[PDB]
Symmetry: C6
């Protein structure tokens, strides 16, 4: 079968808080764009065309909906205003781990800076936040652990028609 887009999520945390705080998940996800590209030029000589390949250039973006009572966005704003490194995780919820690493998910690890921070409030729409990152180097592949509270959704349960007595 096909793989849905819902199963891919993102995590963040600041570099200097690696000892005090663990990873934290954004409140509301909408979408994100992860795309890498390379530059290919051709040099012509009398023996034939030769191709030299350039360095990897990353294009990263994220979109979310601002929640009320949220403190984490202020952390990202302060990290942008002070040029601090941000850790990014991209985790898949469909591919689980085998043998030695059961109950682990397939993930990639990046470190980069924040380069853009914009939001436009309208008169009839909810706030949307766009963040664009600049990544230092090639991302690495590995397996990561996702907690139970960060993977499951919350919905109401069945209740009877009897009083809710104090």
């Amino acid at each position: 079968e096909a793989k849905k887009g819902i199963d891919v999520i993102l995590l963040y945390r600041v570099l200097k808080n690696e000892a005090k705080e663990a990873a934290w998940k954004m409140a509301f996800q909408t979408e994100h764009s992860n795309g890498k590209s390379r530059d290919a030029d051709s040099t012509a000589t009398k023996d034939g065309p030769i191709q030299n390949m350039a360095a990897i250039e990353y294009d990263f973006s994220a979109t979310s909906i601002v929640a009320v009572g949220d403190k984490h966005i202020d952390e990202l704003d302060d990290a942008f205003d002070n040029s601090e490194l941000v850790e990014i995780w991209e985790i898949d919820k469909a591919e689980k781990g085998t043998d030695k690493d059961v109950d682990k998910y397939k993930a990639t690890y990046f470190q980069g800076y924040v380069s853009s921070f914009s939001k436009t409030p309208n008169s009839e729409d909810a706030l949307e936040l766009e963040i664009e990152f600049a990544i230092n180097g090639i991302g690495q592949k590995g397996y990561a652990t996702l907690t139970t509270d960060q993977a499951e959704v919350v919905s109401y349960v069945f209740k009877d028609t009897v009083k809710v007595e104090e």
Copy 2:
């Protein structure tokens, strides 16, 4: 829950009138765009890529509907024609203050110049005014006080079927 866009408003006042006049709210708000960005360039050396970050560049805008009998817009036009500094406030109506600063809202403070002032009257639409600012330095985060008259809306009340006797 989510945060609506109606909870964000703007205030203006001219720098040279800081002693005589307090802050004033524009009549009709439609939307505005607040976005900050940075430019990242890569320099290549034989040891690896190095990233240098540049100064912060701001992108600010405002949109409104002109009211009849309004004097404030003339003040902005005069300030634009004479290159005077304008103070800008962005206040949230959802995040209230704690302990020492109860009944205060989370706000951000700017100072900048006016750079654009345009309006296009049609034959069947109301006048709309678009203003663009140029900000000198990084905005500061703090708590601000909003008066009761500037936060509440006005609507008609219940009336009986009796006369309005003089």
Copy 3:
């Protein structure tokens, strides 16, 4: 209340005809665009950013529907073909004058050249004329007088079912 777009009109007259002819209103108005802007560049030094502002640049335009039996458009075309100065007024019909200037309206005064003159006739649409101006200097604010004939519209009156006897 909101200000409608129908309350803003324009007047024209050529500079060399200031003694013989008074101001005249062009026949059919559709819309116009009045927008002023400035250029803000930043110079970087070791002590901090410095802001320098340049001269004001104007963006003016007009749109109309050509009337039959109209001579005034020929005057504008001849003024364009000979580089003559054209006076432009922008008058508001909603803001009336006080005390000494009762029955006067708020207006602005410009002098500029004609730089564009285009029209495209179709097979099922009426002719539309687009004019663009190049303004010499900053417009001045003042109060202007508008005649009764140029401010009111004309509609048919009630008639009986009796003949129109010669």
Copy 4:
């Protein structure tokens, strides 16, 4: 009342056929664009801005539908392939002449070269021919004579239900 776009037509003839052939009208007109513009630059000095106005630049275009059995288009093609001058007339059918020049129409006279000649045949649409001219100098205003056959349309007349006997 307003002026419709139908009342404006165009005429052509080649310069070297001034004595042998009179003016000829295109078969099917759809639309055309006549627009003139000027370039305005500003030079800054210590005494104030100075404006120098440039030469007039013309923008001309025509659109038509190719008719079957038409020879005139080949004349335009040969004139384009050999760089010959083409005379263009733009005549209004609503403004008639007075006293000395009764039964004459208001017209403008141009001479220019042909610079573009394109057509794109589809599988379900009729052929359309697009021509773009380049005009040598300023057009002149005058009155021109239009023949009766070139101004009136042709429609069927009433016929009885009797035979059409040879």
Copy 5:
């Protein structure tokens, strides 16, 4: 009456096969674009503007639907991969020949190279092939002969309700 676009077709053949093969018509035609243009620049001198005209630049294109079992497209691909000259004909089916050249059509003759060859297969649409040519010199006007099989369409005929007995 008007001229439809279905009456214009194209023919091809390779230059080196002028003795062994005659002209061949492409299987399915959709549309094509034939447009010629010139560049006009103005040089200013103290006596007046002077206009100089440059060489003719051609813009040619073709669109078709690939047929199954077709060998001709491979010939065009081979000619493109080896830089061979291609002959192009554009023939009208509405203008027939007179006196000496009865049963001949009005045509135009070109010789050029192939410069583009692209096709994009989708999941629910038929294949479409787009070819662009680069023409060496001015096309020549003349009369050409079209065979009976290349001008008529094929449709089913009437059949009775009796068997198709062997």
Copy 6:
């Protein structure tokens, strides 16, 4: 008959795995773009225009839908991150082979690098993967063999209303 777009498929395999692994078909195909072009410039001399043609430039692309449990995409990503050559085949399912090459299909063979690798997950759409290649030299024409499992589709078969007894 017309040729549908479903009859064209692609195959991949890495150059360094030519001995251990055979060709493999990627799971879900949507579309792809194969386009080749050349650059034609004209040099002017006193004897006439001369045409010079440059090297062939390729434009290749692919689009697909990511499947769950798929390992092959990781191979392409690793080949991109390490600059390895990738073999590409384009096979037609409508043109079968003759005499000595019965049950073979018409195909083309390319070798190139991976230059782009992007994917954007949404909240209500399936993942789509876009890949762009950079080809070294001109593709070669030949006949290739396609296995039975890679050419046929799979659908359910008829079942009775009796149980599925163990």
